[PDB]
Structures are given as C-alpha cells and as structure tokens.
Amino acid sequence: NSLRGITEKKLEKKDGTKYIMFGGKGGVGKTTMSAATGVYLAEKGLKVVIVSTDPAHSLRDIFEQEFGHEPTKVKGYDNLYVVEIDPQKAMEEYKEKLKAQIEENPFLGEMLEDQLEMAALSPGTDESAAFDVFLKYMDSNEFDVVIFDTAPTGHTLRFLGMPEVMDKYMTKLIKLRKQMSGFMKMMKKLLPFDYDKMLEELEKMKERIVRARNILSDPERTAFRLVVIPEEMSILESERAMKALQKYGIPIDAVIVNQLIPEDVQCDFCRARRELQLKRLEMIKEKFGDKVIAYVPLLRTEAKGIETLKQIAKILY
Amino acid sequence: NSLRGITEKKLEKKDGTKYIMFGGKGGVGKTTMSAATGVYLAEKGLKVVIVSTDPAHSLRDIFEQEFGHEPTKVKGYDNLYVVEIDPQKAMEEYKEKLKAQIEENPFLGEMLEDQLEMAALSPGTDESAAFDVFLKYMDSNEFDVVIFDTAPTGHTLRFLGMPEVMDKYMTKLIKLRKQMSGFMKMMKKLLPFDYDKMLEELEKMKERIVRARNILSDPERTAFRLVVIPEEMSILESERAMKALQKYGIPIDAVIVNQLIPEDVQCDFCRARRELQLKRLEMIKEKFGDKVIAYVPLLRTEAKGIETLKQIAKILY
Amino acid sequence: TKYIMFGGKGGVGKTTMSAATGVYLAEKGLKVVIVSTDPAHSLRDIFEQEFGHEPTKVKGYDNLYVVEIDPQKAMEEYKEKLKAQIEENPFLGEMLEDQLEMAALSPGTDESAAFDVFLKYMDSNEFDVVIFDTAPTGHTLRFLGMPEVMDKYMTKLIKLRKQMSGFMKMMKKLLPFDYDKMLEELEKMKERIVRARNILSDPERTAFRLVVIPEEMSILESERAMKALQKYGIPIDAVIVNQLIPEDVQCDFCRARRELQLKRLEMIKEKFGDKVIAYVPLLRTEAKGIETLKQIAKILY
Amino acid sequence: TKYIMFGGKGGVGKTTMSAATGVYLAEKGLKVVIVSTDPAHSLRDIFEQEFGHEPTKVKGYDNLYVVEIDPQKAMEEYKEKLKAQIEENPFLGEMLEDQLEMAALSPGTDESAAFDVFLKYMDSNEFDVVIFDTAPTGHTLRFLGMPEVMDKYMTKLIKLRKQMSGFMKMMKKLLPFDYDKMLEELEKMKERIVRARNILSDPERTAFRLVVIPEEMSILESERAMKALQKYGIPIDAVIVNQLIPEDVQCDFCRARRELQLKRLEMIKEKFGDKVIAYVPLLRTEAKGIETLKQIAKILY
Ligand SMILES: Nc1ncnc2c1ncn2[C@@H]1O[C@H](COP(=O)(O)OP(=O)(O)O)[C@@H](O)[C@H]1O
Ligand SMILES: Nc1ncnc2c1ncn2[C@@H]1O[C@H](COP(=O)(O)OP(=O)(O)O)[C@@H](O)[C@H]1O
Numbered sequence A, B: 001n002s003l004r005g006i007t008e009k010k011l012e013k014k015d016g017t018k019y020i021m022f023g024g025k026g027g028v029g030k031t032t033m034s035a036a037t038g039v040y041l042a043e044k045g046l047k048v049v050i051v052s053t054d055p056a057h058s059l060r061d062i063f064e065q066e067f068g069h070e071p072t073k074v075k076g077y078d079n080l081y082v083v084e085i086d087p088q089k090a091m092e093e094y095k096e097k098l099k100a101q102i103e104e105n106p107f108l109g110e111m112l113e114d115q116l117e118m119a120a121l122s123p124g125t126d127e128s129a130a131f132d133v134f135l136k137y138m139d140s141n142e143f144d145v146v147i148f149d150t151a152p153t154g155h156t157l158r159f160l161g162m163p164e165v166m167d168k169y170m171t172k173l174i175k176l177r178k179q180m181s182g183f184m185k186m187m188k189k190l191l192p193f194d195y196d197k198m199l200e201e202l203e204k205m206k207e208r209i210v211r212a213r214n215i216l217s218d219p220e221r222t223a224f225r226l227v228v229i230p231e232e233m234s235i236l237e238s239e240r241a242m243k244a245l246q247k248y249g250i251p252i253d254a255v256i257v258n259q260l261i262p263e264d265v266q267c268d269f270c271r272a273r274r275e276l277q278l279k280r281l282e283m284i285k286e287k288f289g290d291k292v293i294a295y296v297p298l299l300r301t302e303a304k305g306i307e308t309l310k311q312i313a314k315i316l317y
Numbered sequence C, D: 001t002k003y004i005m006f007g008g009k010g011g012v013g014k015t016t017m018s019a020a021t022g023v024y025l026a027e028k029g030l031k032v033v034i035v036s037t038d039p040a041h042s043l044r045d046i047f048e049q050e051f052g053h054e055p056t057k058v059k060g061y062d063n064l065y066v067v068e069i070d071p072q073k074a075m076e077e078y079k080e081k082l083k084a085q086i087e088e089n090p091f092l093g094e095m096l097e098d099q100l101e102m103a104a105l106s107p108g109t110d111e112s113a114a115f116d117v118f119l120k121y122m123d124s125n126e127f128d129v130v131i132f133d134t135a136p137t138g139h140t141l142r143f144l145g146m147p148e149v150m151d152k153y154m155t156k157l158i159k160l161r162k163q164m165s166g167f168m169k170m171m172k173k174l175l176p177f178d179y180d181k182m183l184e185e186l187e188k189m190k191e192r193i194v195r196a197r198n199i200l201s202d203p204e205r206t207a208f209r210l211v212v213i214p215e216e217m218s219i220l221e222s223e224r225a226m227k228a229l230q231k232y233g234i235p236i237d238a239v240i241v242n243q244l245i246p247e248d249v250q251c252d253f254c255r256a257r258r259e260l261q262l263k264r265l266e267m268i269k270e271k272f273g274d275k276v277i278a279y280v281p282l283l284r285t286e287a288k289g290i291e292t293l294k295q296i297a298k299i300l301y
C-alpha cells in the first residue's frame, strides 16, 4: 500500500505521458510489478501501456494472451495495452517491403536484402531495436502512462550521455566542411568534372535523446522503481545501478522488496530463510533507507493470473 | 549427483577445450550452477575458466573476489579462472592507445576518439563485446574446459546462421568486382587520373563462426545445460529456447531443476508451494523428460560462499 | 551579347583574324573582348602588351579587352587562401594541396580550364561582343552533346535513390546508428551547357568563322570540322582565305606558288562555295603591329 | 629505342619534319614509328593513307609505321565488352556506360589519351626509333614534375594509414561488424613517369627538335618553350628553320618578305645560335607527296 500515494502525486504534475520503469536483477519480479502496476493504473480509468523488450515474452506468460508489435488491448480492459517487441518479425516485414521496391533490379535487391539479413543476425539488434521503440514511446503521447519493462541499468541507459559527444563530433564535422568547401570548388573548376545529411541525422538524434533525458531526469513525469529480493546479490547490484542512474541524474522514488516470506511460518526451513531475509532487510533499510520502501510477500500461488495480479496491486496500493 | 557421469563422458572425446554453457531465465541460478561446476571441475586437477558477460558482475558477488578482463585465478585455486567483461574499461584503454597514435594530428584524433565514444555509448556494444570474447574463447585453447555464463538463447545465438548469408553476399561482391574491374580500367586509361579487404574480413569471420558453430553443435566438446525452476515461466521459456537451440542443432545434455523446496516441510505455506512445485515438476518431466534431469534444493543459506558452492557441487555430482 | 569565334588549322591566322576583328569592332563604339586559351600567349606577341586573367584594356582603347588564360597561376593563387583557412587540421591542408598540385599538373587542365572560362563568358554579359580565340573543332566542342547523357545518368541516379531510400531507413532502425548534391551539380552543368549550346546554334547571336589557306591540308581539315560543327547544328557564316599572294608577282617562284593557290582556291570555292568567302592577301610585312591590324581590318571590311 | 620529337607553333611544319625524318630513317633499314596525337589527322593528308590506332605500315615501306590516336573509337570499342560482361546487374551497366560517355566527352580526354599512348611508347620497345608528332611544350610536358608531388602525397597517405590502422581494428571489436591499392597505382605511375623523364632528359636516347619560321611569333614562342624544356632538363639538339624563301627571287614582294626573313634569321642565329641550326626552303610545290618528303629528307640530311 505504501506506494500508492507517491504514484498519485507523480500523475498530476507535468501533464502529458507519465513514465514508470522498473529495474532489478533477473527474476526479482520486475515484469510482475510492471503487469501489476499496469492493472492498478488501468483500474482507475487511465490509458496505460506496458512495453517489453523481453525476447522471452514474459507478458505473454503472465497475461496468457499473445501480443504483437503494435499496442494490444489486454484481458477485456478497454484501457490497458501491452507492446511486445519482436525484431525478427519486423525484419521479415521490412524484407517484404524492400523486395517490393527492388523489382526493377534483382541484383541490387538481393544484395541489400543480404546486408539486412546480416544486420538482423548481428549481436546489437535486440538492444538497439529495444532502443528504437524506447525512443518511439518517449517521443509519444496518446498514452496517459507508459511502463517500460525493458530492464534499465545505468549501463543500458549509457546512450543518454551521447548528445555531448555528438556535439563535439558535429562541430568537428562543421570545421571539416568549412575547410573542405573551398578545396572542392577549386577541384570543381580546375578539373571539372553528404555532410548536411550526416549533420541533419546527428542533430535529430541529439534532440531526441536530449528530450528523453530531460523527461527521465524529471520527476512529475518519470518514476524509476527498483525491485529487489532479500538477498545480497540483488541488493548490491541494485545499489550500483542506483548509483549509475544517479550519475544520469535520475529520480528513484521507490524500492520494492519482493517475494518476502510472510511473518507466519513454522517449520525450521522458512525460519532460517526468513531470519536471513530479515538480515538482508536491515541491509536494505540501511542502503536504500533514504528511499520509499514497499514490501510484497512470497505468494502461496505462483504469480500468474489476473487475480494474483490484482492481489499484488492492492498489496502495493 | 545425476549429472557427474554425463560430464565425465563429455570430457574424454574430442581432446582439446571442452565447452559447457548454462542458460535459463533471469534468476533461476545459472551463474550459480556455473560457479559450482567450475569449482567441481577445478577439484579434479583441470584448468577451467568461467567467462561472464554479466555487466552486473555476479561472479564478483558469489566469489567475493574482483575479476578483471584478463583471466584471474580465484580463491587460492591454482587451476580455476574467471573472466569478467567490462566494455567500458576496455574502451578507456583503447582511448589511451588511440591518443598515443594521434599525436602528429589532434584534429584527426579528437574526431576518431569521438567516433569511438559514440560507438561505446551505442546500444549494441554490450552484446557485441560479449560476442567478441565468446569467439575469442571458441578459438582458444590452453583452457581444458570453458564455462560460458553469458546467457545463451537461440536469439542471442542467432549469429550462428550468418555464414550462409555471408556466402551469398560475398558471391554478390565477387560478381560485382568482376563487373567493375573492367570499367575502372577504362576509366583509368581514358581519364587518368577495398573489395579484397572486405572479402578478407568477411571470409575470416565466416570461418570463425563456422568453426564455433561446428564445435557447439558437436557433443564430446560442448554441452548445453538448461537450468529451470518449478514455475511455468522458466519452464515454457526454457522449452522455447530449447527449440531454437534445436534449430541451430545444439545438444542439450541436461536440465537442472533448481531451488527445490526440500521434502521435509511442515507449515502450510511451503506445503502449498511444494504442491505447486510438484505439479510443475511433472510438467518438466513431461516436456524435458527426454533429457537428463538434475535436482538441486532450495538452500537454507543463501548461496554465496565457496562452502555452499562445494555443497551444490556434490549435490549435482 | 554576340559571340564570334574563329577556327582552323595551326598557323592559318585565326589569332590574327581574331585580333583584327577585335580592333574593327572596337573602332565603332562597342565593348568587345577577345579571350584566348593559347598557352602560347599569341596575343601578347601580336598586341605587344601583356595580359592577365582578368580582362585587360588594350592599346589605349577604352573599349577593347582581351583575356589570357593561365591555369597554373590561378591554382597557386588559391593555395594561399587554402593555407589561411585550414590551419587545423594542419595535415589535411598539405594532403589537399598535394591533390591540387597533382590536379594542375594533369593533362586535362589546359583544355578544361579553357572550358571553364568559355562557359564563364557564355553565361556572361556586359561585353557587347565576345571573340573566342580558343581554337574550336567539333572534337573540342564535343562537350555540347553531354546534356542528354547527363539526363540518362540523372534519371538512373533518381531510380537508384528511390530504390535505396527505403532500404537505408530500415537499416537505420535495425542498426542505429550526397545524391541531392550530385543531382544539383549535374543539373546545373546540364543547364549551363544547354544554354551555351542554344546560343551557339543560333545566328543573330553567334557567328562561327573558318579561316583557311590555299593548301589541301587546311582545306580538307576545315571541311571536316565544318561537318562536325554541322552535327552540332552550328552556323558558319564565313570562310576566310588568308595569306593569299597578291596578284602582282613576277619571279617564277611565286608564279608557281600562286598557280597552286589558284587551284586550291577553286577547290575552296567548290567545297565552301555555299557560304560567304572573304580574301586576305599575304602581307609584305609580318602581321604584328596595330597598323597591319587595322589594315587587315579594312581588308575584311 | 631512340626517341625523336618535334615541337613548335601551329603550322611551322613539325608534322612535315616528322614525316620526313620518318622516311629518312626508314630509308636505312630501321624500324621507326611516327605517333600523332593530332585529332586533325595531318598524317592522313600528308601520307594520303588512313591510319588506325594500332601501328600501320605506310606506303609500301615494310619498316615504316605511324600511329593515329582516336579516343572516341577506343571508348566505343570497349563499351561492347562491358555490355557482354555486366548482364546482371543490368541497371549497373547502363550507369557505368553513362559515366563512360560523360568521361569521353569531357575536355581532358584528348590530351590525356595522348598522354596514355605517350607513356605506352616510352615504356615500349620493338621500335628502333620513335617519332612523337604530339606537339610538346614545357606546359604539355608539365606532368614530368609530378613524381615528387606523388612522393609527398604518398608519404602523407602512409602516415594516414598508420594513424587509422589502430583505430579501425579497435572500432571493429567495439562494433563488429583501399589504401594499398591507391599506393600501388600511385607508385606505379610514379615509376612510369620517372622512367620516361629519365629517358627524355638523356641524349643518346631522346632528341628534342624545335622547328621555327623566320617570324617573331614562332621565334619568341619556341624560345620560351626551349626554356621550359630547359627547366625539365631536356636536350634540344637541333633547331630547324622552315619555309625559307629560296635565294633566287626577283619580284619586289618576295624581296621584302625575304629581307624580313633575313632579319628574323639573325634573330634566330642570336637566340638559338648555341645549338645546331638547319635550314629548309619554301618549296615551290606544297609539301604532300612522298617525293617532296624524300626531297626534304635529303635537304635535312
Ligand atoms: N510476489 C510474488 N510472489 C510469488 N512469486 C513471484 C512474486 N513476484 C514475482 N514472482 C515470480 O518470480 C519470477 C520472476 O519474475 P519476473 O518479473 O518474470 O522476472 P523479471 O523481473 O526478471 O522479468 C516469476 O516467475 C514470478 O512468478
Ligand atoms: N540452490 C540454491 N539455493 C538457494 N539459492 C539459490 C540456489 N541457486 C541459486 N540461488 C539464488 O538465486 C539467485 C539468482 O541466481 P543467479 O545465478 O545469480 O541468477 P542468474 O542465473 O540470472 O545469473 C542468486 O541470488 C542465488 O543466490
């Protein structure tokens, strides 16, 4: 319940799309918290999207409904949407589209299609298509609140520090073009017989990233939430990640301790395990104590159905 | 204990480096199983490396010792090594090295350094440096067994399907060079006054990936292990991943069910939870039944110290 | 602006006829320029006055100008500016300068700078009449047939850009992270050459004059050249027979030579008979001074 | 292989002297070629026989060959091959062909193809003596000063490649996933031009001959050209005064003209006096037939 108030406060200011994003180690339940917050926010009439760059398609399993690239309404909710990212499917569509253009020339076309196939099969495309859709929804509106289940770290978010580098490189390209512009004219006269485009795209990207950065670094719009478990791994990790997000100047309004073993436990096993969870809980209330901390228990049931989802919802709110 | 025999069998054939790689959902304990298998294999005199593309640096937390990029001996073991990947640190080193070269020219150098800064800050570099080191150790020897804690999926391993695409594109480039080679000569005569390199690098990469693919698709060298939990998420996920690895023709010798609640449990909580874990266990013995299945319990202690590590070791062996 | 241009074999006196026509047109108040792509700088010898690249008034004439082309000088002149502008990168400036020197020393630059100034004055006004002493042939003027080739190649580049434009964006989103310029320059050149071609193919604006000698070489040559100029659709209003031995001659030598010149004159009045033929004699004096120039002027007019 | 090359103003008879020297050298058993970059195809008119690009025997001489340069033809010839080879991509072939036509029509191709065949025969053997009727000047021959510029630019490219080589690999590992060729061609050209320059600057191999007329134009011109050739360190073994009016002349016309020719002859024996001067008269007949050719031959030898 401890989180509700903070959320409510976040919603009002800076009218427009509000962003919420959960982060934490693998497991640890951030996809879970995302789905739950989506359901809760969708309970009040609100138009909320949950975007997921998960290739494992976790939201498919949690919701039990398949989701395409385009936003899909979920579970009879008129107002709740989820965006699943498949770079491969997209890629097939782009291939159809390209093939359509290349009819006049097969050789040019088979070549370009090959280059694309290689591009898609390259190691960067997951994270970079993730990037593309992220920017698409940072620039977007028509969604009252956006929940990123893309799992952020300072290291995944390192692209936020680019615009300055882009500035330096751009001024370099401008100096260069000024030096060159004279020479190429004399070559164009003595022996007759791209930059503006590179600068266009560079500047465009610079502005997109700068906007996104300004939105993310601003509360009243974006809320970063850490989710953790009472175990040293997730605690230390999320601490470091918190420090990197700090380096990007990002607000973290809340930490969520998850899968807590309930206070009623009897057999020695869960006795020991909960002793440990209490030690780690003191560790958490030490390191993360300056932040709002929420607690969710370890459910008797596995957390799957919308019922368990609404349950967790009320547990956080 | 059920896994030991299979491992032993894997070690003997195809003398050279033997590869073992664990995969599964976030959490689920694959870094854990990796560390444990590393310890176990290091117990018999064997030279074993555990490489981790984890930016969260899990092995630092589990072992409690810091690891650099170059292989580092761990915990008094003369024979046990772990490789942690930091792309950023590397990047700083590359920057020092570049700056050293650019002294004659600052403008060229500041530009190139800018391009690199942008490269490193780009969304692909984590996964692609992961790729680079992966290939480095596929091509490598002097390590008796290599354990990849890089978390593989069919989708991360999609780069294995490239060599054919590279073949098509290469033959395209050859046809092209044959068509061009005539023309450029007449231009070189009528109006006086890269390919071999592109083909060199393309072919080189093609052979590296082909070698790696052939090694990974071959038992007696590489063993892919899935680790799962008695929960629908990890089960379905690891099933799909198993199918993609199947598409790349990869052997999966073993599935490891982890964090099992021990058979002695009393209070109703763990009663319900273990009932569920049994249902999911039947689900597992159904889907994954054609594979060797190993069981590890949920430890009273959090799994951190080398003692818990050796414990889990004997539990699997 | 009216354009007059003389052509013919080496020697044969087209630089001479150019100078003379310049003087004659400058006699009536008219502003006339004689541009010369001669690296030989023949106009320097004929006029006796030195001429720079920029149009220079000649021989006390307020209205008569001539332009001499030196490519080397222009190159070197630009180099200084280049130095001033690219200080950093310092290495780049030296490379670019090297490319420039390599360019200037290349075999194309004479003819192509000739081309550049030609187009400069085809596009120009403020000169009532322009006289080109650049020596035209159909082969020198072959650049006039370009604009159609430029069209084909341009449409090729457009089809190409339309084919590429889709691919590049998709590549960009899959892997984040010149044509318009090439087409700009190509189209600009196409329009300059089309304009020039249209002016040159049009009388009331441009007059092409052939100059010849009563010898088979120049006759046959200028005939072929006439046929190429024909292929570009160019008017040739006049043929000028030059260095004719005057009708008063006595010793057997010039008797024989003038007999030959008469045979070749019938050859000329045969081949070139369909156009105006003018006759200039072989002057007792070498043709140098402005006096001989005005003399030849009145001889043609 | 020995090289002989004539130079001088338009007219002035260097094509003539070339043909004559060719005949004379072909009289003694010798294998001699006369190559001509004349688009005017003067040798076609002088010899009366047509000549293709490949060396053609002339006038029943087993040993006398001449090479006429037509660039257009060569281009067109290659186009067919290009078509046969690039079928797919079909679009590419049309673009490349367009670039080819655009190249051939460009103002540089005459002089630069002249250059190409020049280097072809400088590198060549199997011809005992080669006579270049391409009309040399220091300005035409300015390409000889390149190899040093090529050196500077090459070392620039090497420093550059060393600076880049480190960066590119690191970029490659950070983001997976021409010079040697440029240096190959640059160095090759540098060696060809250096060889040619060394041969041309060396007597016992190459003889540069200037031809002039007793008129201030050709005299001053060929003097300056002589000074440029001097700047490239070239031997000029002989000056040939041509079209001299014979000493038997009577009527006042040729009296005056030959007076002038004598003044200019003293000018020549002044400026060019330090080198061998040869004299050829103005022939009663136009110089065309092989008979007049052999005549001039004996006149020079
Ligand atoms: N409060 C909870 N009670 C019980 N199980 C939970 C709870 N929160 C999360 N889980 C379980 O933890 C597992 C990992 O959570 P998930 O959000 O899918 O991982 P990730 O955060 O890495 O995407 C899921 O199988 C989920 O069912
Ligand atoms: N047998 C086990 N008993 C108790 N805890 C375990 C066991 N195996 C794994 N864990 C815990 O599960 C968490 C996730 O495991 P880890 O391997 O770090 O995740 P990943 O596989 O995603 O790298 C770790 O904190 C680890 O301590």
Ligand SMILES: Nc1ncnc2c1ncn2[C@@H]1O[C@H](COP(=O)(O)OP(=O)(O)O)[C@@H](O)[C@H]1O
Pocket (backbone or CB within 6 Å): C009, C010, C011, C012, C013, C014, C015, C016, C017, C042, C242, C243, C244, C280, C281, C282, C283, C285, C286, C287, C288, D010, D011, D215, D216, D217, D218
């Ligand atoms: N009508 C003429 N009478 C006498 N000499 C002439 C006459 N026309 C030209 N010449 C001479 O012929 C030579 C070459 O003429 P020029 O016009 O310089 O050649 P080009 O036309 O090739 O430039 C000059 O020395 C000039 O003095």
Ligand SMILES: Nc1ncnc2c1ncn2[C@@H]1O[C@H](COP(=O)(O)OP(=O)(O)O)[C@@H](O)[C@H]1O
Pocket (backbone or CB within 6 Å): C010, C011, C215, C216, C217, C218, D009, D010, D011, D012, D013, D014, D015, D016, D017, D042, D242, D243, D244, D280, D281, D282, D283, D285, D286, D287, D288
């Ligand atoms: N010695 C000579 N006697 C008579 N006519 C000559 C003599 N030398 C050259 N000519 C004539 O002068 C004209 C031009 O000479 P040519 O050699 O063709 O010029 P270029 O040397 O510029 O090619 C030709 O028509 C030729 O007949």
Ligand SMILES: [Mg+2]
Pocket (backbone or CB within 6 Å): A030, A031, A054, A058, A149, A151
């Ligand atoms: Mg998730």
Ligand SMILES: [Mg+2]
Pocket (backbone or CB within 6 Å): B030, B031, B054, B058, B149, B151
């Ligand atoms: Mg891990």
Ligand SMILES: [Mg+2]
Pocket (backbone or CB within 6 Å): C014, C015, C038, C042, C133
């Ligand atoms: Mg002239």
Ligand SMILES: [Mg+2]
Pocket (backbone or CB within 6 Å): D014, D015, D038, D042, D133
């Ligand atoms: Mg000639």
Ligand SMILES: [Zn+2]
Pocket (backbone or CB within 6 Å): A265, A266, A267, A268, A269, A270, A271, B265, B266, B267, B268, B269, B270
């Ligand atoms: Zn219990």
Ligand SMILES: [Zn+2]
Pocket (backbone or CB within 6 Å): C249, C250, C251, C252, C253, C254, C255, D249, D250, D251, D252, D253, D254
């Ligand atoms: Zn007489």
